[PDB]
Amino acid sequence: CTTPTAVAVTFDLTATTTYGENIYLVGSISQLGDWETSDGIALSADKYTSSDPLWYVTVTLPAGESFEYKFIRIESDDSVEWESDPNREYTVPQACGTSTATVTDTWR
Ligand SMILES: OC[C@H]1O[C@@H]2O[C@H]3[C@H](O)[C@@H](O)[C@@H](O[C@H]4[C@H](O)[C@@H](O)[C@@H](O[C@H]5[C@H](O)[C@@H](O)[C@@H](O[C@H]6[C@H](O)[C@@H](O)[C@@H](O[C@H]7[C@H](O)[C@@H](O)[C@@H](O[C@H]8[C@H](O)[C@@H](O)[C@@H](O[C@H]1[C@H](O)[C@H]2O)O[C@@H]8CO)O[C@@H]7CO)O[C@@H]6CO)O[C@@H]5CO)O[C@@H]4CO)O[C@@H]3CO
Ligand SMILES: OC[C@H]1O[C@@H]2O[C@H]3[C@H](O)[C@@H](O)[C@@H](O[C@H]4[C@H](O)[C@@H](O)[C@@H](O[C@H]5[C@H](O)[C@@H](O)[C@@H](O[C@H]6[C@H](O)[C@@H](O)[C@@H](O[C@H]7[C@H](O)[C@@H](O)[C@@H](O[C@H]8[C@H](O)[C@@H](O)[C@@H](O[C@H]1[C@H](O)[C@H]2O)O[C@@H]8CO)O[C@@H]7CO)O[C@@H]6CO)O[C@@H]5CO)O[C@@H]4CO)O[C@@H]3CO
């Protein structure tokens, strides 16, 4: 059993946008570049604006262990305000199940 090795997690975040920007999910994982949004988890507006006013998301992480989950909110001024105030710890278990959960939050 090694087919399901990714982690589909749905994240959401109420922080409004401006048809141009991205609110991400940088969690500490090899594919979740928590410390380089280049591989965290961006959120956008498929229904909302073009950028992302409700900041929703559904990405997959190829891993199965403890992962840090810091959040970063990239604005339209090209500048990530790595929301590092709060914090999350997705312990994705390496099994045939329990490899996809939620990850909701919001901006203060
Ligand atoms: O990848 C695993 C790596 O993650 C952690 O280490 C640090 C991580 O690399 C940093 O990114 C940091 O989080 C930063 C985050 O990216 C942004 O919020 C950032 O703010 C912006 C700034 O404009 C600027 O900081 C920059 O961010 C970084 C660049 O993306 C990057 O190119 C870097 O340039 C190099 C560094 O000069 C060099 O020191 C190198 O460091 C390595 C470490 O020695 C190694 O331990 C490893 O650590 C792991 C570990 O799991 C976590 O601690 O990280 C490096 C890989 O070996 O990193 C670059 C190598 O090319 O310049 C800055 C660094 O500040 O751009 C962002 C927006 O784009 O600031 C955050 C600062 O925390 O998390 C940790 C350090 O806190
Ligand atoms: O502060 C105002 C708020 O909105 C600002 O601009 C919005 C404006 O509506 C447009 O500029 C649009 O931008 C484009 C984008 O590609 C799509 O939105 C697109 O689609 C339109 C179509 O006509 C159709 O899809 C239809 O469907 C929408 C509904 O009409 C509408 O009810 C919507 O509901 C959500 C809205 O998208 C928006 O209000 C959303 O955000 C609210 C939050 O309170 C907060 O984020 C903030 O957001 C700003 C935003 O950053 C600005 O850019 O206030 C919003 C409240 O006003 O939450 C609503 C919850 O129901 O649902 C569907 C979306 O699929 O209408 C849409 C838009 O009318 O239109 C444009 C190009 O076609 O969206 C931006 C982004 O909100």
Curated annotation (Swiss-Prot):
Positions annotated as glycosylated: T2, T3
Residue ranges of every copy of the CBM20 domain listed in the record: 1-108
Region called Disordered, residue ranges: 84-108
UniProt biased composition (Polar residues): 96-108
Family that this chain belongs to: Belongs to the glycosyl hydrolase 15 family.
Name of the molecule in the record: Glucoamylase
Organism: Aspergillus niger
Gene: GLAA
